[PDB]
Design an enzyme around this catalytic site. Sequence first.
Site, PDB file in Angstrom:
ATOM      1  N   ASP A 134       6.739   1.230  -6.869  1.00 46.05           N
ATOM      2  CA  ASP A 134       5.973   0.226  -6.126  1.00 46.05           C
ATOM      3  C   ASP A 134       4.794   0.808  -5.333  1.00 46.05           C
ATOM      4  O   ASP A 134       4.251   0.119  -4.451  1.00 46.05           O
ATOM      5  CB  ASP A 134       6.899  -0.608  -5.228  1.00 46.05           C
ATOM      6  CG  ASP A 134       7.695   0.227  -4.253  1.00 46.05           C
ATOM      7  OD1 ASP A 134       7.289   1.381  -3.926  1.00 46.05           O
ATOM      8  OD2 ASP A 134       8.717  -0.312  -3.769  1.00 46.05           O
ATOM      9  N   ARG A 146       0.572   0.045  -1.805  1.00 46.30           N
ATOM     10  CA  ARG A 146       1.967  -0.396  -1.851  1.00 46.30           C
ATOM     11  C   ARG A 146       1.944  -1.846  -2.352  1.00 46.30           C
ATOM     12  O   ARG A 146       1.224  -2.698  -1.819  1.00 46.30           O
ATOM     13  CB  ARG A 146       2.543  -0.335  -0.429  1.00 46.30           C
ATOM     14  CG  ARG A 146       3.962  -0.919  -0.245  1.00 46.30           C
ATOM     15  CD  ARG A 146       5.001  -0.132  -1.072  1.00 46.30           C
ATOM     16  NE  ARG A 146       6.408  -0.440  -0.735  1.00 46.30           N
ATOM     17  CZ  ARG A 146       7.085  -1.523  -1.150  1.00 46.30           C
ATOM     18  NH1 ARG A 146       6.509  -2.428  -1.958  1.00 46.30           N
ATOM     19  NH2 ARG A 146       8.370  -1.650  -0.807  1.00 46.30           N
ATOM     20  N   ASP A 197      10.363  -4.643  -3.840  1.00 50.20           N
ATOM     21  CA  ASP A 197      10.931  -3.349  -3.476  1.00 50.20           C
ATOM     22  C   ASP A 197      11.590  -2.732  -4.695  1.00 50.20           C
ATOM     23  O   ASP A 197      12.534  -3.301  -5.247  1.00 50.20           O
ATOM     24  CB  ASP A 197      11.914  -3.510  -2.316  1.00 50.20           C
ATOM     25  CG  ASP A 197      12.322  -2.174  -1.706  1.00 50.20           C
ATOM     26  OD1 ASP A 197      13.432  -2.134  -1.190  1.00 50.20           O
ATOM     27  OD2 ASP A 197      11.521  -1.210  -1.714  1.00 50.20           O
ATOM     28  N   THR A 198      11.038  -1.626  -5.177  1.00 48.91           N
ATOM     29  CA  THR A 198      11.704  -0.851  -6.224  1.00 48.91           C
ATOM     30  C   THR A 198      12.703   0.137  -5.614  1.00 48.91           C
ATOM     31  O   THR A 198      12.507   0.629  -4.516  1.00 48.91           O
ATOM     32  CB  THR A 198      10.686  -0.086  -7.135  1.00 48.91           C
ATOM     33  OG1 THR A 198       9.788   0.691  -6.344  1.00 48.91           O
ATOM     34  CG2 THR A 198       9.836  -1.078  -7.978  1.00 48.91           C
ATOM     35  N   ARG A 230      -1.360   2.589   3.823  1.00 47.05           N
ATOM     36  CA  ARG A 230      -1.307   2.162   2.425  1.00 47.05           C
ATOM     37  C   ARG A 230      -1.933   0.783   2.290  1.00 47.05           C
ATOM     38  O   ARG A 230      -1.666  -0.111   3.100  1.00 47.05           O
ATOM     39  CB  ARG A 230       0.141   2.138   1.873  1.00 47.05           C
ATOM     40  CG  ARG A 230       0.848   3.484   1.969  1.00 47.05           C
ATOM     41  CD  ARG A 230       2.305   3.443   1.458  1.00 47.05           C
ATOM     42  NE  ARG A 230       3.096   2.436   2.170  1.00 47.05           N
ATOM     43  CZ  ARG A 230       4.376   2.170   1.921  1.00 47.05           C
ATOM     44  NH1 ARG A 230       5.033   2.839   0.972  1.00 47.05           N
ATOM     45  NH2 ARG A 230       4.985   1.190   2.589  1.00 47.05           N
TER      46      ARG A 230
HETATM   47  C1  LIG Z   1       5.580  -3.991   1.230  1.00 49.60           C
HETATM   48  C2  LIG Z   1       5.301  -3.774   2.712  1.00 49.60           C
HETATM   49  C3  LIG Z   1       5.926  -2.726   3.392  1.00 49.60           C
HETATM   50  N1  LIG Z   1       5.668  -2.502   4.687  1.00 49.60           N
HETATM   51  C4  LIG Z   1       6.321  -1.425   5.429  1.00 49.60           C
HETATM   52  C5  LIG Z   1       7.656  -1.980   5.942  1.00 49.60           C
HETATM   53  C6  LIG Z   1       8.612  -0.803   5.823  1.00 49.60           C
HETATM   54  O1  LIG Z   1       8.596  -0.016   7.036  1.00 49.60           O
HETATM   55  P1  LIG Z   1       9.554   1.260   7.269  1.00 49.60           P
HETATM   56  O2  LIG Z   1       8.879   2.458   6.626  1.00 49.60           O
HETATM   57  O3  LIG Z   1       9.560   1.396   8.759  1.00 49.60           O
HETATM   58  O4  LIG Z   1      10.852   0.888   6.596  1.00 49.60           O
HETATM   59  C7  LIG Z   1       8.017   0.046   4.708  1.00 49.60           C
HETATM   60  C8  LIG Z   1       8.748  -0.179   3.379  1.00 49.60           C
HETATM   61  O5  LIG Z   1       7.965   0.450   2.372  1.00 49.60           O
HETATM   62  P2  LIG Z   1       8.660   1.356   1.241  1.00 49.60           P
HETATM   63  O6  LIG Z   1       9.599   0.421   0.507  1.00 49.60           O
HETATM   64  O7  LIG Z   1       7.550   1.960   0.418  1.00 49.60           O
HETATM   65  O8  LIG Z   1       9.424   2.424   1.959  1.00 49.60           O
HETATM   66  O9  LIG Z   1       6.670  -0.366   4.526  1.00 49.60           O
HETATM   67  C9  LIG Z   1       4.810  -3.375   5.405  1.00 49.60           C
HETATM   68  O10 LIG Z   1       4.631  -3.176   6.638  1.00 49.60           O
HETATM   69  N2  LIG Z   1       4.175  -4.388   4.788  1.00 49.60           N
HETATM   70  C10 LIG Z   1       4.396  -4.657   3.474  1.00 49.60           C
HETATM   71  O11 LIG Z   1       3.856  -5.664   2.977  1.00 49.60           O
HETATM   72 CA   LIG Z   2      10.562   1.237  -2.390  1.00 52.48          CA
END
Ligand SMILES: Cc1cn([C@H]2C[C@H](OP(=O)(O)O)[C@@H](COP(=O)(O)O)O2)c(=O)[nH]c1=O
Ligand SMILES: [Ca+2]
Length: 129
Positions: A15, A29, A34-35, A75
């Site tokens: 992802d 991202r 969520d992958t 990202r």
């Molecule tokens: C997809 C997405 C993730 N995120 C943030 C939330 C999560 O925070 P945390 O890192 O604190 O868990 C993290 C999950 O991404 P990943 O699934 O790449 O880890 O990215 C956003 O803020 N907005 C989004 O739209």
């Molecule tokens: Ca992921």
Amino acid sequence: LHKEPATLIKAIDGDTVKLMYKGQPMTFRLLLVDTPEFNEKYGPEASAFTKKMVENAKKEEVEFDKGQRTDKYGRGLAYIYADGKMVNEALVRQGLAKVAYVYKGNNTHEQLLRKAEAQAKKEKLNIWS
Ligand SMILES: Cc1cn([C@H]2C[C@H](OP(=O)(O)O)[C@@H](COP(=O)(O)O)O2)c(=O)[nH]c1=O
Ligand SMILES: [Ca+2]
């Protein structure tokens, strides 16, 4: 929403993808999905799926939603299209991602994606197996 040009720099995992956008390298991202991480079940398969999809594309595009365009890590947050086909939706349709991280005002494609998830689940595909 509007599709905008970008060019692949490198597949990362299921992802995330590095794309050149407006001439600058960025990690994107994927919105609304969520992958599994590479080190989890279906993680490698998700990575491989995204990788094939974007590497094989003749044309990569990014589509931002109405809300935040970058997350707290810097990202980019977008829907990514390979030859007009949405990578986010395709992952979900194949049971290689769950619909997830649905934040208000960045959720234009939510219902399209949930419909794909229902089908993948009905088919018992991959993560739904
Ligand atoms: C997809 C997405 C993730 N995120 C943030 C939330 C999560 O925070 P945390 O890192 O604190 O868990 C993290 C999950 O991404 P990943 O699934 O790449 O880890 O990215 C956003 O803020 N907005 C989004 O739209
Ligand atoms: Ca992921």
